[PDB]
Amino acid sequence: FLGRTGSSWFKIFLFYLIFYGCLAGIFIGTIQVLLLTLSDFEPKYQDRVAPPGLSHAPYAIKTEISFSISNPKSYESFVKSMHKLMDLYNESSQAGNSPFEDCSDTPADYIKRGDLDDSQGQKKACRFSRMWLKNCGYAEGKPCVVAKLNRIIGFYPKPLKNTTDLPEELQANYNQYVLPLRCAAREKIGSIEYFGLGGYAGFPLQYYPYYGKRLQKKYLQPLLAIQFTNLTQNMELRIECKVYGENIDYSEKDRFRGRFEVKIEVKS
Amino acid sequence: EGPDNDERFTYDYYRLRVVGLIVAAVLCVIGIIILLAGK
Amino acid sequence: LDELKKEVSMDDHKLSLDELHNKYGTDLTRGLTNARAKEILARDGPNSLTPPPTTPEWIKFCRQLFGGFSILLWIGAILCFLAYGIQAATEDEPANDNLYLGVVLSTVVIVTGCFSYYQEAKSSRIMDSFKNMVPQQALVIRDGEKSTINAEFVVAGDLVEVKGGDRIPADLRIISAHGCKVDNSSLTGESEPQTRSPEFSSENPLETRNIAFFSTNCVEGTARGVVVYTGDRTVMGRIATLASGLEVGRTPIAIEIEHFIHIITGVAVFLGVSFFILSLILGYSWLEAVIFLIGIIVANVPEGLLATVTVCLTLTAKRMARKNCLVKNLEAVETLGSTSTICSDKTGTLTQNRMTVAHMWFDNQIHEADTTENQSGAAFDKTSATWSALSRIAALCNRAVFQAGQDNVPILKRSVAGDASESALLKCIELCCGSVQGMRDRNPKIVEIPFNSTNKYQLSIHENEKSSESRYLLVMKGAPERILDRCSTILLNGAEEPLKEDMKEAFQNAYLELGGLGERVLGFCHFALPEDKYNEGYPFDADEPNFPTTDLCFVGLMAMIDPPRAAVPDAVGKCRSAGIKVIMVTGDHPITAKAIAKGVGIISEGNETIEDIAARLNIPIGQVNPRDAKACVVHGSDLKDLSTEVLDDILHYHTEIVFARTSPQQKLIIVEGCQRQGAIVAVTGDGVNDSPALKKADIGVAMGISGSDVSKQAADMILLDDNFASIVTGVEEGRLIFDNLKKSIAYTLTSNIPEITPFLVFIIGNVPLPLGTVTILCIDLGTDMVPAISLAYEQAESDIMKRQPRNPKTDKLVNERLISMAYGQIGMIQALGGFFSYFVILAENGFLPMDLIGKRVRWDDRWISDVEDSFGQQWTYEQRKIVEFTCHTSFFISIVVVQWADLIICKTRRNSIFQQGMKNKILIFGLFEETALAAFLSYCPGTDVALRMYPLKPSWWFCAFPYSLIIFLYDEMRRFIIRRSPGGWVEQETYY
Numbered sequence A: 001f002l003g004r005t006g007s008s009w010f011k012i013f014l015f016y017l018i019f020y021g022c023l024a025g026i027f028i029g030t031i032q033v034l035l036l037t038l039s040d041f042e043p044k045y046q047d048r049v050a051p052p053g054l055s056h057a058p059y060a061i062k063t064e065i066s067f068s069i070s071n072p073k074s075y076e077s078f079v080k081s082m083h084k085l086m087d088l089y090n091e092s093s094q095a096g097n098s099p100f101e102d103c104s105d106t107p108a109d110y111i112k113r114g115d116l117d118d119s120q121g122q123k124k125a126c127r128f129s130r131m132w133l134k135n136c137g138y139a140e141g142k143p144c145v146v147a148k149l150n151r152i153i154g155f156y157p158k159p160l161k162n163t164t165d166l167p168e169e170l171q172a173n174y175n176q177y178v179l180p181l182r183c184a185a186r187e188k189i190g191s192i193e194y195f196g197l198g199g200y201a202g203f204p205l206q207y208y209p210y211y212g213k214r215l216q217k218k219y220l221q222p223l224l225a226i227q228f229t230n231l232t233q234n235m236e237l238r239i240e241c242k243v244y245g246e247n248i249d250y251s252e253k254d255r256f257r258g259r260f261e262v263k264i265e266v267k268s
Numbered sequence B: 001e002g003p004d005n006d007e008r009f010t011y012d013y014y015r016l017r018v019v020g021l022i023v024a025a026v027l028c029v030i031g032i033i034i035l036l037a038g039k
Numbered sequence C: 001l002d003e004l005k006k007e008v009s010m011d012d013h014k015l016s017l018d019e020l021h022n023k024y025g026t027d028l029t030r031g032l033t034n035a036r037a038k039e040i041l042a043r044d045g046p047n048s049l050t051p052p053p054t055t056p057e058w059i060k061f062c063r064q065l066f067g068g069f070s071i072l073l074w075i076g077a078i079l080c081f082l083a084y085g086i087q088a089a090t091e092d093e094p095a096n097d098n099l100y101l102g103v104v105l106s107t108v109v110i111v112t113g114c115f116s117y118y119q120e121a122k123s124s125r126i127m128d129s130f131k132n133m134v135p136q137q138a139l140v141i142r143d144g145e146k147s148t149i150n151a152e153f154v155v156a157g158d159l160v161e162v163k164g165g166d167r168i169p170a171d172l173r174i175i176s177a178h179g180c181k182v183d184n185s186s187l188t189g190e191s192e193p194q195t196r197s198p199e200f201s202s203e204n205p206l207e208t209r210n211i212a213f214f215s216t217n218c219v220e221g222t223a224r225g226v227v228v229y230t231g232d233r234t235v236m237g238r239i240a241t242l243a244s245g246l247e248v249g250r251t252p253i254a255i256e257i258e259h260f261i262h263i264i265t266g267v268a269v270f271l272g273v274s275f276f277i278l279s280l281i282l283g284y285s286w287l288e289a290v291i292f293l294i295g296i297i298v299a300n301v302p303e304g305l306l307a308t309v310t311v312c313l314t315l316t317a318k319r320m321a322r323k324n325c326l327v328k329n330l331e332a333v334e335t336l337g338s339t340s341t342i343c344s345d346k347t348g349t350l351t352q353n354r355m356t357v358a359h360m361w362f363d364n365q366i367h368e369a370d371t372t373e374n375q376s377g378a379a380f381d382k383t384s385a386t387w388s389a390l391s392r393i394a395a396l397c398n399r400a401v402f403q404a405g406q407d408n409v410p411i412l413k414r415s416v417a418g419d420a421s422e423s424a425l426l427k428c429i430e431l432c433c434g435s436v437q438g439m440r441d442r443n444p445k446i447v448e449i450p451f452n453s454t455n456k457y458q459l460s461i462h463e464n465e466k467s468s469e470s471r472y473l474l475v476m477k478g479a480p481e482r483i484l485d486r487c488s489t490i491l492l493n494g495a496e497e498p499l500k501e502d503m504k505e506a507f508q509n510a511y512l513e514l515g516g517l518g519e520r521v522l523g524f525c526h527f528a529l530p531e532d533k534y535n536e537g538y539p540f541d542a543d544e545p546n547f548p549t550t551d552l553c554f555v556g557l558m559a560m561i562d563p564p565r566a567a568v569p570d571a572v573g574k575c576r577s578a579g580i581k582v583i584m585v586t587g588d589h590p591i592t593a594k595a596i597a598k599g600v601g602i603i604s605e606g607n608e609t610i611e612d613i614a615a616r617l618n619i620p621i622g623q624v625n626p627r628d629a630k631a632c633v634v635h636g637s638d639l640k641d642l643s644t645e646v647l648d649d650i651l652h653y654h655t656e657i658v659f660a661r662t663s664p665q666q667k668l669i670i671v672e673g674c675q676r677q678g679a680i681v682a683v684t685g686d687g688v689n690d691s692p693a694l695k696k697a698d699i700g701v702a703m704g705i706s707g708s709d710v711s712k713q714a715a716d717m718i719l720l721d722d723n724f725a726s727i728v729t730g731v732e733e734g735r736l737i738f739d740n741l742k743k744s745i746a747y748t749l750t751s752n753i754p755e756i757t758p759f760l761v762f763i764i765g766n767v768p769l770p771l772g773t774v775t776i777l778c779i780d781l782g783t784d785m786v787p788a789i790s791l792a793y794e795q796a797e798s799d800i801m802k803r804q805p806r807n808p809k810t811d812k813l814v815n816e817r818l819i820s821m822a823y824g825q826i827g828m829i830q831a832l833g834g835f836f837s838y839f840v841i842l843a844e845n846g847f848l849p850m851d852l853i854g855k856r857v858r859w860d861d862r863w864i865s866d867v868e869d870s871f872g873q874q875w876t877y878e879q880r881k882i883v884e885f886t887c888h889t890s891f892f893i894s895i896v897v898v899q900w901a902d903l904i905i906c907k908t909r910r911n912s913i914f915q916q917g918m919k920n921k922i923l924i925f926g927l928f929e930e931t932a933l934a935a936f937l938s939y940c941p942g943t944d945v946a947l948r949m950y951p952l953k954p955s956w957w958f959c960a961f962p963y964s965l966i967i968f969l970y971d972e973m974r975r976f977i978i979r980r981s982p983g984g985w986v987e988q989e990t991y992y
């Protein structure tokens, strides 16, 4: 043919069939043993998710949400992803004592539902009403950004203690039970308004620790609505929403590590 | 621990780097020893 | 163009002196007119040799820059810049990615350019050496006066005068000469002085006495001649142009390199565009479709391989430099191993180029002297009283002396003022009887008759060293038959006895045997002159025979030859055992050529020429079947009238060939003949008459000490100590490197598969990218380098000098068997080991393998800063990327780990590691340094920015270990099958 005879083309096929078969079999074997060394409830390492990220609902083109108030189809892009997240926090979804629970309407302490085991059924998560997110079709003029702290199994987000000075100096300081969030720019031409659980500008500690997808499917993480009703228009405004805490840290490279970078423009 | 389980999200990448660089150096020296057994 | 030059020359030595003046508008006595000379200058041009037009260094570097791998790497580099342009215009990327990779890849091309440029060297200054042979000035007769002129101003026609010491400025017709002898070694390779006289003495202008040639020199006497040829038009000027002009052509190794470049370039463009279409069908944007293509380029092209080849070659060349064997051109390292035919000059190459005493006939007995340089043989006789009598004549009846201040150097190597034969005898006696100067002091010479054309003998009368005699001894030497006709007695064992016809026949027997051995024979005799007839004050007249010259006492015969170099016979045997055909190509006379052929083993015992059969059988040569003769000896004169088709037949039909009395062009023709039959040929020589042959040879090898400057310019290799044994070593080294390059190529290629497959699975599976482009170069230009090189230090697996030369048409450097093994088997196992570690890092950070399929859309999306893993956790962009780059780093390290086994298995093509062992210290150095580099790359701070190399956790290093081991076992089991059954299945499928 190109290389060999008919008889010799068969022997090379019969070889590479058996050979690659065995190879696939061995490869599969090694994946099996890998899997056998892992837990169903918890990953082997967690140092790479370590300090949690802060993510928002408006799908940022390039960490940016620019649109026109005097246009209908200018914000219809951003409302899609906004609806996508909030559509999940529905009350019809949160039905019966299984698997949901009514918790304190004011921020509370952690809840330990035992260990990362299957020694109980599905661990019961606290309910979250979207009605807690006051003022937020969404904010057609001057947006209503929805913030979220990234889920980490066995993570107990700890707020800073009011020992020395703090940026939002002691204001509404629910020191024991709120992980705070403040948005900033100098360059102060905005209007900060914060909506949460019990009205607080933070994440309530009673939704923690997260027990994982396998032990807590349908679990809901707390949200925080931020509304920028700025008396300004037609310019790029770089606004950083930062979370504060003992377990919360940031990075020069990772610009999402416990913070936002939002480039709002109401170019109407 | 219970609420104080911060160690679970920590890894000592500093020591690892120190140890790794030690090993790298030593393996490098060993190589020279073996190579220079006659030039 | 050069085909005119490959032919023998036509001449005008046949004309009369007068007739020759007519032809050039010239005067025999007065010479040319200052006006007629200057006229003929502007007519014909300068007595000068013009160097050939060369390809400048600019174009030589750039011609490498576009050679298969470099082209694909250019397509890569430009496509990087294209993707960077497309980005810079569209979405403002603050990244350096495609810019920096395009800068890196173009540097790779440039640096790889230098390596291949270094390998493709051509150090040729042939025509410069020839130009050195024309004197600065010549002595001409013009307007009846002699004047020295710039030799370039020499024109056909003027009268030139030459004397002992000066170079022949142009081709001359001798019109007048007085005791003129000339050194024609340029034409013949033989330096014995040749007489020049005005008389025509052979139809052959290269043999007649009335022509003297440019490129030769006058040794003694004086001559006047008419310039027949100038510059380029001279006999050797034509040889100059021929030698300088010949097209170099591609080496065996270079042809092999290009051959695999096509194979790998082939598979590169196949998979390249095969997956470029496969992506767009799966619906990838043209923005992305280039980035993957760039990957594929870098994946397929073995970026460090050509550089490896160069370094391996270089390191082999260094070993040979260390055995006094200088290699001018890197590729010539190999060619010697691919050689199937050696065409060898005799004089100064196979032989020492020094008339040496070979045998002695005394006491009715043939004795044999030791002819070797270092004197490796044994003593013959010392005891006999005859010997000392013979020894005495040899020292006394001799006018040769050692040059001043030679006491340091050995006897056989020191320069002697005198003819070759007298030098030989001088050295012979000085060797086995100590100081000859001693003997000549103890026996002062009173009168002598020097060797005459007419007498054919030389005699001396000496004061006898004996106290009890102190009287006069006559000693004489010369032509054996002429010495015999002057004898009455023979010194047998001590005492004289009558010259009976019995002993006279025994002499003739001894004489014909020695003469038959191609040796020059001299007779030796003395006569103790009667005391009462010769006073202590007696006067001897040399001019008129004042003393008897008949009835003397014959003492002995001595025979001499330009003998083989000590190592030559064995070297020839060894070359033949390796299945190399050894041909003698010499300018020397046939009797001598043949005798040495037998001596060195070119002609093995019992083999015959047509002429040998005819003489034995006492039948005409026409009556002999030429197929019965396995040996042949062809004279240049006969070769001259044979067509190339007839030469090819001579070549095909004989195993043991001697081309004698060949011209320089003729040696080229024989080389070309051999080459035309498809053979890789080596030439070994030392003379300017070897230059065209050395040039045309696949590899030319020159003698370092004995060699002329021209010869060493034409060669690819110099034997700096004239050690012919080096050819054997060279072929062995050449063979070894060829196998070791296969090993090194296989090793370098194997690691291509684990660099290709991640990119394919990236497309087909929509998983995160397992390995980066940057990461691939860290292997090929980093970690694989020292290991790949180190395979150059592998010993032979078997006796390589026991196998035939490779067939260059069938036995390739890179074949299907290598590709099947590197790409289909070992590299495939390497890919899995890499993948495994990838799945390990990801699974342990929360992304189980199942959830990875079709995740890239969400994974690479810079704006999704909440990707959900298998456990329900949420990741930022940079967070998951750090894990991904850690996967790159561990994939990289997995390659290193599987390259450990690959290095060990590539060590041997046939034998077990348990057989070959681990005695390659460079290889072990490779293993340690490779791992030190990888560890350094992973753990050094800042390499996460510069190369995206992240720290690996200790457990990460061990992922690929079972795959590394499987390689080692698999290959060990496979080679076990090869050895156990030479038959063929595993052999014909996998045996590199």
Ligand SMILES: *[C@@H]1O[C@H](CO)[C@@H](O[C@@H]2O[C@H](CO)[C@@H](O)[C@H](O)[C@H]2NC(C)=O)[C@H](O)[C@H]1NC(C)=O
Binding pocket: A086, A087, A088, A090, A092, A093
């Ligand atoms: C989650 O909540 C939203 C609340 O707006 C639901 O939207 C409703 O959709 C229907 C049909 O398009 C409208 O007629 C209603 O006015 C909407 N609101 C309410 C309060 O009923 C959305 O359909 C819900 N999704 C799921 C999957 O439950």
Ligand SMILES: CC(C)CCC[C@@H](C)[C@H]1CC[C@H]2[C@@H]3CC=C4C[C@@H](O)CC[C@]4(C)[C@H]3CC[C@]12C
Binding pocket: A003, A012, A016, C757, C760, C816, C817, C819, C820, C821, C823, C824
């Ligand atoms: C990523 C995976 C799925 C792709 C695997 C590629 C396979 C199909 C390739 C790569 C190497 C290839 C082999 C390389 C060597 C030879 C010798 C040649 O004379 C005929 C074909 C043959 C026998 C090839 C058959 C196909 C082969 C085994």
Ligand SMILES: *[C@@H]1O[C@H](CO)[C@@H](O)[C@H](O)[C@H]1NC(C)=O
Binding pocket: A134, A135, A193, A229
């Ligand atoms: C939000 O809506 C409420 C009525 O539901 C109204 O009282 C209030 O003015 C609104 N807030 C802002 C900031 O527009």
Ligand SMILES: [K+]
Binding pocket: C298, C299, C300, C301, C302, C303, C751, C752, C755, C776, C780
């Ligand atoms: K490669």
Ligand SMILES: [K+]
Binding pocket: C694, C695, C696, C697, C698, C699, C700, C714, C715, C716
């Ligand atoms: K050559």
Ligand SMILES: [K+]
Binding pocket: C302, C303, C748, C749, C750, C751, C752, C780, C784
């Ligand atoms: K490679």
Ligand SMILES: [Mg+2]
Binding pocket: C189, C345, C346, C347, C348, C349, C685, C686, C687
């Ligand atoms: Mg010679």
